[PDB]
């Protein structure tokens, strides 16, 4: 057949996502929300324990059973609660059992636009794996965008500091990534446990979530980004287990574009670092930015090549030593957001500085191809343009 495979493979993750976010369709009650909270925590522990990702089907079936039991011994007002959690529990149980019996084993390893679609998917997966550190940084980015651009979370400094020492260090990055996933799960547990009605009502910032919908998205998107990173790592391992040159770049326009996109930061990196530092100093307008630009012009002082490289690990070190203290002093801005973005670019540079793996110039004095018709302009016209 055709449709039965597509309906039998995309079952468990979408059903768990529908069943876990369908909680809290009601007033202040601990009865129905803590089930979905413990379900999301169990899914996070299953993903992060790296051996029980799909090998606790007893626990999944027992969670479905407890959900159905609560939905059948609990439930214009008595027509949506029994239709939400009843059907949700039944669908979850059916999905979990069916997937475990056939879909889980098959997935695990113990008009022709579809080929282009799959090739673009594989290439985006490859770039995600190469940019896994960058993807984690983008998760730090949305973290601070909820933290320092929407509202400071419950000791958000701890998570932004986990990010801060995760950025420049590759020995830290995976372990502090998993510890950040764990701390975000604990933060979501404490967030959904704080909306109670027995509260009897500056280093804590318990914001007392009123509407019981807005005080969860800053942790829901966090766990969703951690789960998208874990799913991208798992799909990268699965696609690895299944299934131009740096000197040939100047042969075709496509080859030049490919050698650009592969190495867009390679011999451009410190340039873009200086550019992002300049944009941050322009945008912040503070004496903290005055000291930042002082150290930036000090880094620029060592014009000679390889001198800056020595100071660049110390550059990342005082960058994180400045940014973490800045966030803690703001606790008790968007300028700090772009400063964290600059520190992220500088950490990426401090990573890829030491890449020790790795003359048709008179051709580029006349136009013999499109590549050199643009090459001559870049070499000569740009100087006049500047």
From Swiss-Prot:
Effect of inactivating the gene: Embryo lethality at midgestation with defects in vascular remodeling. Conditional knockout mice in inner ear hair cells show no auditory and vestibular defects.
All ranges on the Extracellular side of the membrane: 27, 151-153, 285-286
Top-level taxon in the UniProt lineage: Eukaryota
Cellular localisation: Endoplasmic reticulum membrane; Endoplasmic reticulum-Golgi intermediate compartment membrane; Cell membrane; Cell projection, Lamellipodium membrane
Intervals, Cytoplasmic compartment: 49-58, 168-181, 242-268, 303-315
Expression sites by tissue: Expressed in bladder, colon, kidney and skin. Also expressed in bone marrow, liver, lung, spleen and erythrocytes (at protein level). Expressed in myoblasts (at protein level). Expressed in red blood cells. Expressed in cochlear inner and outer hair cells (IHCs and OHCs) and vestibular organ HCs.
Spans traversing the lipid bilayer: 6-26, 28-48, 59-75, 78-94, 139-150, 154-167, 182-196, 214-241, 269-284, 287-302, 316-331, 334-355, 370-386
General function of this protein: Pore-forming subunit of the mechanosensitive non-specific cation Piezo channel required for rapidly adapting mechanically activated (MA) currents and has a key role in sensing touch and tactile pain. Piezo channels are homotrimeric three-blade propeller-shaped structures that utilize a cap-motion and plug-and-latch mechanism to gate their ion-conducting pathways. Generates currents characterized by a linear current-voltage relationship that are sensitive to ruthenium red and gadolinium. Conductance to monovalent alkali ions is highest for K(+), intermediate for Na(+) and lowest for Li(+).
Complexes and interactors: Homotrimer; the homotrimer forms a propeller-shaped Piezo channel with a cation-ion conducting pore. Heterotrimeric interaction may occur between PIEZO1 and PIEZO2. Interacts with PKD2. Interacts with STOMl3. Interacts with TMC1, TMC2, PCDG15 and CIB2; the interaction may be part of the MET complex. Interacts with MDFIC (via C-terminus); the interaction prolongs Piezo channel inactivation. Interacts with MDFI (via C-terminus); the interaction prolongs Piezo channel inactivation.
Further remark: Piezo comes from the Greek 'piesi' meaning pressure.
UniProt similarity note: Belongs to the PIEZO (TC 1.A.75) family.
Name this protein carries in UniProt: Piezo-type mechanosensitive ion channel component 1
Organism annotation: Mus musculus
First-to-last residue of the parent protein present: 576 to 1165 of 2547
